[PDB]
Design a protein around this ligand. Structure first.
Ligand SMILES: Nc1ncnc2c1ncn2[C@@H]1O[C@H](COP(=O)(O)O)[C@@H](OP(=O)(O)O)[C@H]1O
Ligand SMILES: [Mg+2]
Ligand SMILES: [Mg+2]
Length: 358
């Protein structure tokens, strides 16, 4: 019982992917407390044209104005499940749509999308079927956990700089001035809840959103959202080519699924300053590698994701929230399955299961 991941197996036409619609949202505050509203959403506020160029110190405030989320707490699907519980009757699709859907985090689907091209980091996905619905929840691999606990200082500062970039580009109110004098607190998050469909697989997923563009042409979410990214400055065509082949694939897969149309990138120099910005429309990212022998192909990404969802659906036969089918993958191998029950892999909490049962 295994699933192959080589790109040439998935090189056919681009599958059907239904335009995502936003069903709702939720926020996590500076204490990581859930709120069923948009209080955490920030507003895109880039450097005023006809003014000084970007000149952002991404090291400013590290580490004495840094409040990092405690990554030892494994929340799994818990926050999305709370949202689903509070909106289960109000769900679209009519009677039984949820029973035919797959529920997960946007980032879990992103990892599936990139799997045919991924050569460094493996993953594990726990799957449980409950009342027809297939739930997918990532499990930290042993290697990932050891790498997290032993994170070098350079990597921890690099991670801070990406969060700090958002503080220079976003404001708490529309049209407001960004305020970098405050704290970077990575417990704070605004999450969009979206519905889509990949082939014949209905999807319900949530993803954290960086900011909202109030000046965006369309007011209908998710089309007004903006993704913010940093990357090292590049100086040669070879460096840009490596960026197109490896980094843009990850950016595309993250923003394509929720229908975020623009990624705004700040390019940081060796001293940690962002002195240039570039906008990458999600739907044009593949153009950079369309004629590249070493490029990626969104059809392969999407066809593999569809194949995995079919593979997962047919593998997970039992409707049991205590039962976990664990899907494991390492680069160059197939996705393999093992079966487990209860702790530690079981991830649907009793408060969700009991409420849905009653
Ligand atoms: N496992 C990880 N490895 C490297 N960077 C990570 C990371 N987890 C979080 N980050 C940080 O989270 C920030 C915000 O993510 P996102 O861009 O997806 O909104 C990232 O900024 P960058 O994306 O600019 O690197 C990065 O700094
Ligand atoms: Mg983000
Ligand atoms: Mg971002």
């Amino acid at each position: 019982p295994s699933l192959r991941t080589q790109p040439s197996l998935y090189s056919g036409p681009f599958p059907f992917y239904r335009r995502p619609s936003e069903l709702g949202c939720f926020s996590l505050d500076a204490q990581r407390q859930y709120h069923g509203d948009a209080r955490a959403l920030r507003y895109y506020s880039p450097p005023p044209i006809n003014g000084p160029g970007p000149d952002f110190d991404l090291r400013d405030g590290y580490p004495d104005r840094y409040q990092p989320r405690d990554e030892e707490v494994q929340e799994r699907l818990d926050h999305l499940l709370r949202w689903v519980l509070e909106h289960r009757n109000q769900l679209e699709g009519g009677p039984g749509w949820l029973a035919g859907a797959t529920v997960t985090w946007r980032g879990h689907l992103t990892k599936l999308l990139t799997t045919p091209y991924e050569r460094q980091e493996g993953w594990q996905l726990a799957a449980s079927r409950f009342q027809g619905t297939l739930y997918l929840s990532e499990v930290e691999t042993p290697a990932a956990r050891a790498q997290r606990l032993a994170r070098p200082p350079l990597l921890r500062e690099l991670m801070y700089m990406g969060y700090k970039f958002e503080q220079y580009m976003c404001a708490d109110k529309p049209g407001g001035s960004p305020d970098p004098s405050g704290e970077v607190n990575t417990n704070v998050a605004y999450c969009s809840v979206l519905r889509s469909r990949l082939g014949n697989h209905p999807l319900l997923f949530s993803g954290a959103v960086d900011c909202l563009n109030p000046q965006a042409p369309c007011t209908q979410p998710p089309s007004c959202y903006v993704e913010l990214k940093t990357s090292k400055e590049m100086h040669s065509p070879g460096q840009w080519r490596s960026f197109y082949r490896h980094k843009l694939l990850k950016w595309w897969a993250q923003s394509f699924l929720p229908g975020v149309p623009h990624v705004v990138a700040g390019f940081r120099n060796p001293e940690g300053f962002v002195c240039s910005l570039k906008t990458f429309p999600t739907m044009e990212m593949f153009e950079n590698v369309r004629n590249d022998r070493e490029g990626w192909n969104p059809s392969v990404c999407m066809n593999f994701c569809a194949a995995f969802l079919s593979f997962a659906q047919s593998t997970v036969v039992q409707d049991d929230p205590r039962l976990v089918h664990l899907f494991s993958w390492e680069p160059g191998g197939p996705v393999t399955v093992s079966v487990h029950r209860d702790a530690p892999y079981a991830f649907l909490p009793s408060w969700y299961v009991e409420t849905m049962t009653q």
